[PDB]
Write a protein that binds this ligand. Structure first.
Ligand SMILES: Nc1ncnc2c1ncn2[C@@H]1O[C@@H]2COP(=O)(O)O[C@H]2[C@H]1O
Ligand SMILES: Nc1ncnc2c1ncn2[C@@H]1O[C@@H]2COP(=O)(O)O[C@H]2[C@H]1O
Length: 266
């Protein structure tokens, strides 16, 4: 004897939550809680959904409209624009996780439609695994050159998005000629980078801890120019195409510079 979801509201929430990585991870039982618990909130253009330093109440996902993230350096100072977010983006988790006052104001730019979880529901289904994942990858993200330019909050969202993957000896990760799927950063292990020429395979590069690969197919929407294959057991984390593209900003210059190592210059 349990209350039934409204299948139409479930479909609507699912459409909004597609691609948000915090909800993609939840298993089916927690998803049932989300689909029965989330509620609608609207905000007119220019109105604040939350103000920096407020006590936390809800966690939000944008359904329609865009919002500005504004951060003051202190309560007596003017807010600075930091970023603009839109459909599928979430905000408001930090206060609910860490018990801190809100770290930013969030202002509707357009009229906005949101789906919201209250604090008790957030604590039940999202708090534990979100906090753990961010903690577990903090040291890694701070010491990998690829991530040098990420802000502290960008590190947290990068941790949310990264997916662990394990590769056995001789296992192919990306195959020359195939469409790009994911971007990989090596935690431990070793990869051979192999490329065919006149029907002969040769090894053109060797990758190890904190190196990365798979970016060119995703950045330029083209097939992989090489095969990357594990040499022994390797542990990586990956970003899928959608997450790579969403989070590319603070990485792009490092990724572009690094391509210098792929060919002698002219
Ligand atoms: N650079 C940022 N720094 C801190 N919080 C941010 C930032 N960008 C977006 N946010 C979101 O803004 C929210 C404001 O309230 P919270 O601090 O509960 O959680 C915060 C994050 O979800
Ligand atoms: N010399 C190299 N030339 C081309 N790609 C390389 C080289 N060394 C490592 N790689 C990586 O191999 C990857 C194979 O797939 P991508 O083309 O998506 O991006 C490529 C780079 O990340």
């Amino acid at each position: 004897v349990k209350k039934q979801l409204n299948p139409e509201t479930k479909a609507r929430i699912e459409k909004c939550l597609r691609g948000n990585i915090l909800f993609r991870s939840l298993g089916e039982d927690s998803l049932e809680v989300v689909y029965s618990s989330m509620f609608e909130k609207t905000a007119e253009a220019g109105h604040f959904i939350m103000k920096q330093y407020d006590e936390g109440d809800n966690f939000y996902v944008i359904e329609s409209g865009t919002c500005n993230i504004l951060i003051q350096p202190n309560p007596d100072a003017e807010p600075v624009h930091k970023s603009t977010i839109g459909p599928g983006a979430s905000f408001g988790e930090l206060a609910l996780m860490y018990g801190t006052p809100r770290a930013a104001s969030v202002q509707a730019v357009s009229n906005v439609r949101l789906w919201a979880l209250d604090r008790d529901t957030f604590r039940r289904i999202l708090l534990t695994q979100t906090m753990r994942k961010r903690r577990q990858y903090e040291d890694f993200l701070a010491q990998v050159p690829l991530f040098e330019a990420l802000t502290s909050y960008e590190r947290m969202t990068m941790a949310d998005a990264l997916q662990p993957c394990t590769f056995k000896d001789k296992e192919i990760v990306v195959k020359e000629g195939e469409d790009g799927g994911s971007f990989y950063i090596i935690i431990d292990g070793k990869m051979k980078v192999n490329q065919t020429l006149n029907g002969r395979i040769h090894t053109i590069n060797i990758l190890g801890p904190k190196d990365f690969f798979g970016e060119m197919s995703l950045m330029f929407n083209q097939p992989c120019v090489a095969t990357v294959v594990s040499e022994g057991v390797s542990h990586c984390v990956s970003l899928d195409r959608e997450s790579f593209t969403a989070l590319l900003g603070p990485m792009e210059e490092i990724l572009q510079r690094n391509m210098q190592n792929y060919s002698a210059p002219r």
